């Protein structure tokens, strides 16, 4: 499967980037992400800020340092050998048209289809707030890839060291439906395409499921009867514990 | 001239890969960069220059600020030699590049080659002339071949950005006939009024 | 400058030998260090796990006890009790007049190397052993050297009282 | 006097990443931040220098590397100064040895308050990170530091430069803090995915757990240990509830 | 590859070392004393001939 | 509460270097026992105050 | 590819359009006359003189008249042996799409022999053979239960080009959202 | 459980003395009385199981499968006998 694994170091470095560059008014801040992604599983292992300056009435005016990518990459090589160029990061909070022109810059210097990692920095999303995209041909267009945490056995203990189901799943689903609805109302305003095709399809495939849930219930009912037995087996071990206690208690009184 | 950090904007239009100059317009241009770099560098032991493209394939920063000539030349020779000049943007990005400058004692200056005709809005070009002054920056235009088929927007840009010419701007207008481009550029004020030419 | 470089090798650490007994896991290994003990040791990134597949001799850190590099497999080779004499000291024309014994030894040792092929087509196994008896250095020792020479074969002399030494598992290892 | 080093989250994480990856060879780098008065050492950021197997020695600290990197740091608006160095030992604990001491000493002659930070990532799997912070005798505020007081005056008067440990605190930032907890909609997709596939396979999952249960009942009969028998039954019950819940 | 030499030191331990230029590979051979360091395990110098016991008893009459 | 303390006590406990197995050669009257210890040589030790 | 850039000369549009019209009638390879609406072969160029045939093709497919199929074709397209079989294929696909949308409002996909026989204007026996040819291709991924006289259909339809479909979709999106919302409420509660 | 950690000597657990106590035999021949981890027990351990013990502190950190075979005293386990009775 196609997968991205992202270090906490990456995202906390991004957290630091946005304050440490004083980027304000929902402007773009840009850096390079590094790792190993010669394969189709992106492993993101390191990162760096890149000097970036934007104009306040043009975002297609940008200043980005080409020499820095090249020069800092050489320093990266001298330090560890795991820390190759695979992509870049931006502060989001959405995609831009101007994202392409920068993505086009990184394309020469990568050995895979350039990864744009959108790190949201406002921390007002749900779950892992970061969404990962890769530029391919459609013009050129960005496409979502699954983005998940990383682990190194020291690093995960250190993440915890610093800090020391059903309802959620369902809430997040309704949340989705609500968002799908918003988008549709907006489209309807615009009208008076891909989206529509998708909505129709979904519909076709609660209603269709209804009939089959009836079959599931008979199998679930066997499972509940199983539960009934299981409690009784456990109950047997609990009872034993009470007797052992009892013997001790009686002996204690006597002496 | 004075102590200055220059972003050099080079024009690699479709014009430039064919004759308008001896033998090639691209081959006229290359001799002048070396001469502008040396003219400045010999005056004062502090002076840095950066290189950017307009025409080519969108504005790109080829080279950051440096005091070594080999980098500029190396950057110049990796160019895409055809396209069209993205004037408005080239000035804006160059001004953006200037803020990063290697030393902060220096003045902030753009030296641009204009080889090919332009088509910019006049109202906008004046706003740029004084946004350069939103950030107190100077600009020098080296113009040729525009004066044979189109207007000079660029003079008005020189008059508008204008403050005293120790601080700001020159318009260096070079007749485009045969004769080495650097020499021509020298009889225009940018290799005159120098410390060491 | 060569001497100064020699001082520079001294600044780099010792590095102990062990042999892999068995792969416990692909992150954890059982190695028996050649210092005696058996240990659970780890690995580093730079090495590969296919190059740690057992009976390989490996190189261990001094105190860190993780696999720093792997050398080729060996059992740590001998030259003082696996004592080598390339070819012999005499040829078979140098000791002619033992003829019958020459002819028989020729056919049994040289010939299976040169053609296995004849013994295979027939389907019988090849000869594998030769025994010499007689008093030694009357012609007996002479034969044994002379045969090695012609084949180019490496003569490997074992002293029987090198194969008894008074430590756990050494006798087994030499043979 | 009392000294308190705040090591930050993003520093911890760069130190630990690097040091685990270098194994069994040591990795060392420079700690970036600011010194404040005599009571606070901030480590804000950290970068790695080249690696060492020799225990870190004076010839080995790249004069070029630190200068070249800082000049680049400068243009991304990292402008705060070196406050010390951190170094790995995997295999040896969180301490000094004489080579580190000589390294350390040379740094302090440059600075005046520099800290040596040692991580051992073999003891960062003790389910805490062991980390230490050190400084030699260096005085000029440490003149109230190592019924008393004759001792320490004579201790700095008989010998300048002998190690001591320093105290550790971690100060962090709330956005860093929230990021650490949101590690554990992709989320929605995953939990649900397993739930679906569990339900497909349950016909088999049913059968094996009766067999385990059948065993459990039998064991307890012979038995007439207890903890084990209970735990086995507890796992079976837990799993059933989760399975009824799933549909 | 490396100039690998194995020595077995008289503490019953085998080590894998490189050859330093402070010895020659023509001085490495069994049945010889060589002086190997206690702590970096590198053959600093080559020592007088013949390993271990130099004949456990012989009466010498010169 | 006791279960938390108990674990704590074990955590401390585990940092011992361990005990040796030994064989009693003989008891004497002096409060010493002669022990032939198996990892090491033979030792005279002074037994505990509890026996 | 052609209409944004490359070869926007009228000549090139006109030859390519003529080829498009001839091929649609000969084939049945990709959907029906929706493809012709979205991209131009009668409104970058002429609406008449062998693009008359297109408007008539639309009337013929919905209605299912054989006579309207006969009249639209002129000698060049008609002589070719290929087209006539493929005329019946296009008629079933379009008719099938219309009945199915109608019934579909939750999850209904049951359409009788009688609905399809009617649409095509062919008795049941001709339809039996005809559907059997059409499933072979995989233009149908339902199944025909001969002795029930009902077709139980598993979706195959493309469902594309919207104007009617969007109004209906909007109605459905809202209903689903309500159903889910109640589930969500119960979880929230405990 | 976490505190002891790698790198480790291999031993074989000889006998349970009691709860949280064992006599262990190290395989350099030398037998020790040690503590065991409270996460490992009398029925998670057996009189000839292989165990991982700490190098300097000698306490039962983790349980090993038995799968160590000597190779300079030569103990062969042999998959694939390829001879039959014909």
From Swiss-Prot, chain B:
Q: Which GO terms describe its cellular component?
A: cytosol; nucleus; proteasome complex; proteasome regulatory particle, base subcomplex
According to the entry, every stretch annotated as the VWFA domain falls at: 5-190
What is the protein's given name? 26S proteasome regulatory subunit RPN10
Q: Which residues of the full protein are shown?
A: 1 to 197 of 268
Write out the similarity annotation. Belongs to the proteasome subunit S5A family.
Role played? Multiubiquitin binding protein.
The extra comment attached to this record reads: Present with 17200 molecules/cell in log phase SD medium.
Q: Which GO terms describe its biological process?
A: proteasome assembly; proteasome-mediated ubiquitin-dependent protein catabolic process; ubiquitin-dependent protein catabolic process
Loss of this gene results in the following: Cells are viable.
Q: Does the keyword Transport apply?
A: no
Curated annotation (Swiss-Prot), chain D:
State where Zn(2+) binds: 87, 89, 100
Q: Which top EC class is named for this enzyme in its record? A: hydrolase
**Motif position, JAMM motif:** 87-100
Q: In terms of domain of life, where is this protein from?
A: Eukaryota
Q: Which GO terms describe its cellular component?
A: cytosol; mitochondrion; nucleus; proteasome complex; proteasome regulatory particle, lid subcomplex; proteasome storage granule
Which GO BP terms sit in this record? Answer: mitochondrial fission; peroxisome fission; proteasome assembly; proteasome storage granule assembly; proteasome-mediated ubiquitin-dependent protein catabolic process; protein deubiquitination
Q: How does it assemble?
A: Component of the lid subcomplex of the 19S proteasome regulatory particle complex (also named PA700 complex). The 26S proteasome consists of a 20S proteasome core and two 19S regulatory subunits. Interacts directly with RPN8 and STS1.
Q: What is known of its domains?
A: The JAMM motif is required for the deubiquitination and degradation of ubiquitinated substrates.
- Supply any other comment: Present with 16400 molecules/cell in log phase SD medium.
So what family is this one in?
A: Belongs to the peptidase M67A family.
- Name by which UniProt lists this protein: Ubiquitin carboxyl-terminal hydrolase RPN11
UniProtKB/Swiss-Prot annotation, chain E:
Q: What does the PTM comment state?
A: N-acetylated by NAT1.
Going by the entry's taxonomy, the superkingdom of the source organism is recorded as Eukaryota
* Localization per Swiss-Prot or TrEMBL: Cytoplasm; Nucleus
Q: Name the family.
A: Belongs to the AAA ATPase family.
**Function, as annotated:** The 26S proteasome is involved in the ATP-dependent degradation of ubiquitinated proteins. The regulatory (or ATPase) complex confers ATP dependency and substrate specificity to the 26S complex.
Q: What is this protein called?
A: 26S proteasome regulatory subunit 6A
Recorded source organism is: Saccharomyces cerevisiae (strain ATCC 204508 / S288c) (Baker's yeast)
Lineage from the top down?
A: Eukaryota, Fungi, Dikarya, Ascomycota, Saccharomycotina
**Encoding gene per record:** RPT5
Of the intact sequence, the residues represented are 113 to 174 of 434
From Swiss-Prot, chain G:
Q: Which GO terms describe its biological process?
A: proteasome assembly; proteasome-mediated ubiquitin-dependent protein catabolic process; ubiquitin-dependent protein catabolic process
Q: What does this protein do?
A: Acts as a regulatory subunit of the 26S proteasome which is involved in the ATP-dependent degradation of ubiquitinated proteins.
Residues of the signal peptide: none
Organism the protein comes from:
Saccharomyces cerevisiae (strain ATCC 204508 / S288c)
- Any idea which UniProt keywords this protein has? Proteasome
Q: Tell me yes or no: is Electron transport among this UniProt entry's keywords.
A: no
Of the parent protein, the shown chain spans 198 to 387 of 393
Write out the GO MF terms.
Answer: structural molecule activity
Asked if the record carries the keyword Chloroplast, the reply is no
From what superkingdom does this record's organism come? Eukaryota
> Which cellular component appears as one GO term in the record?
proteasome complex
Q: Where is the PCI domain?
A: 1-158
The protein in question is named: 26S proteasome regulatory subunit RPN9
Q: Which family does it belong to?
A: Belongs to the proteasome subunit S11 family.
User: Anything else of interest in the record?
Assistant: Present with 12400 molecules/cell in log phase SD medium.
